[PDB]
Amino acid sequence: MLIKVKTLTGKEIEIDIEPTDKVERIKERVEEKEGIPPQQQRLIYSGKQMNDEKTAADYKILGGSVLHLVLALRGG
């Protein structure tokens, strides 16, 4: 199942996921094409920060639904 992640500037990235994938796995797939350690990345969905431990199915994420990426350099 293929979803999207949008950075702050507007650049879009397209990533295929599975229902058992962890938020850490999604961060890894993002840094595959971004090379940014997960300590600095943050994922936002419906105004709520993605919990790293949780699974992609926990937030009931569907295909195409954009999980907005945001940077956090200070933390980490």
Partner 1 sequence: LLSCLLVRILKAHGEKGLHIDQLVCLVLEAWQKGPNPGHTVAVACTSTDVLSCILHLLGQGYVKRQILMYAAMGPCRGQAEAVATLASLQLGRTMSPQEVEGLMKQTVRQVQETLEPDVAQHLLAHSHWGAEQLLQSYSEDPEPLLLAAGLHCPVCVSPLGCCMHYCCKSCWNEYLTTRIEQNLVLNCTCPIADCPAQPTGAFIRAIVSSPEVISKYEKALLRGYVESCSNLT
Q: Which is nearer to partner 1, 20 or 74 (CB)?
A: 74
Residues 45-74 contacting partner 1, CB under 8 A: 47-49, 68, 70-74
Residue with tokens 């949780």: 54
Q: The dihedral of CA 26, 69, 71, 58: what is its sign?
A: negative
What is the CB-side half-sphere exposure of residue 54 using CA atoms within 13 A? 11
Q: Which is nearer to partner 1, 57 or 70 (CB)?
A: 70
Q: The dihedral of CA 30, 32, 36, 39: what is its sign?
A: positive
Query: What is the pattern of x (binds partner 1, CB under 8 A) and - over residues 4-43?
Result: ----x-----------------------xxxxxx--x-x-
Q: Which residues bind partner 1 (CB under 8 A)?
A: 8, 32-37, 40, 42, 44, 47-49, 68, 70-74, 76
